[PDB]
Ligand binder design. Structure first.
Ligand SMILES: Nc1ncnc2c1ncn2[C@@H]1O[C@H](COP(=O)(O)O)[C@@H](OP(=O)(O)O)[C@H]1O
Length: 253
């Protein structure tokens, strides 16, 4: 039960819905950034040393350790979508010859606005302290941000670029999606546009369309922000105690 699908789509291109559509088909786990956050936070440093290696170019000896860490991380998983893995799709291809590649795309301008509200907001965007704060509540360190911005640099194949540049991102986003359709043979690749549904995915994977189930539409703007402000408003039990001792505790002043 090794890798069968490689999700090269970038964040906010429908990577969680694709994840869920693959687990419905194969009934096996699919890797995702939310796996790291909610279950395997110990994989952050692994992905980091893997990204440190790719900062410089790799000796043949170097790449075998890359392939040996990717097998460790992705063992037991049938597929992989989202960052930081979508950037390693070339290494995953040579490594799993019987694995196909799916590329989720959407309108480049719709992606940017979404990409700015959820993933990486402009460092002046007031919504910065919000995304960063729920990270702290979930136990995400400075090294998480490190591993996240670095994986972006790797996926776009650019040592650094001013990420506060909307047009720069578009040029990187358009490039990446273009270079994926060039490096990967058409017979091994599928380009899944938002809303394509089961038919293409299932024909390209040679499986039955799941019966009675509807193609996922998860991780929408509405639900990501609602869950965000829900965690910001969350109250630790230790916090509830302090607020109770001011109502009911003996009052000193
Ligand atoms: N089956 C589906 N059909 C239509 N839109 C979908 C969809 N699945 C995801 N989307 C949209 O893709 C984005 C989520 O991508 P990801 O899972 O990689 O984070 C969201 O964009 P919005 O910002 O417009 O809500 C979501 O609404």
């Amino acid at each position: 039960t090794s890798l069968t699908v490689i999700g090269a789509g970038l964040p906010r291109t429908g990577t969680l819905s694709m994840k869920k559509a693959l687990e419905t088909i194969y009934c096996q786990p699919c890797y995702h950034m939310y796996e790291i956050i909610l279950n395997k936070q110990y994989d952050i440093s692994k992905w980091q040393t893997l990204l440190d290696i790719k900062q410089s170019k790799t000796t043949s000896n170097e790449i075998l350790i890359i392939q040996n860490s990717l097998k460790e991380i992705l063992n037991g998983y049938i597929a992989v979508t989202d960052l930081p893995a979508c950037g390693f799709y070339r290494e995953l291809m040579t490594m799993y010859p019987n694995a196909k590649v799916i590329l989720t795309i959407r309108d480049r301008n719709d992606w940017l606005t979404s990409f700015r509200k959820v993933v990486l907001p402009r460092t002046n965007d007031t919504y910065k302290e919000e995304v960063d704060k729920v990270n702290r509540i979930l136990g995400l360190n400075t090294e998480f941000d490190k591993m996240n911005i670095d994986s972006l640099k790797f996926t776009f194949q650019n040592n650094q670029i001013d990420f506060d540049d909307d047009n720069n991102l578009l040029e990187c986003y358009d490039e990446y999606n273009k270079t994926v359709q060039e490096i990967v043979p058409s017979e091994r690749l599928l380009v899944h546009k938002l809303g394509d549904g089961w038919e293409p995915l299932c024909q390209f994977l040679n499986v039955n369309i799941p019966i009675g189930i509807t193609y996922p539409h998860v991780n929408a703007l509405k639900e990501v922000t609602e869950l965000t402000e829900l965690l910001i408003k969350y109250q630790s039990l230790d916090v509830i105690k302090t607020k109770l001792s001011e109502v009911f505790g003996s009052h000193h002043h």
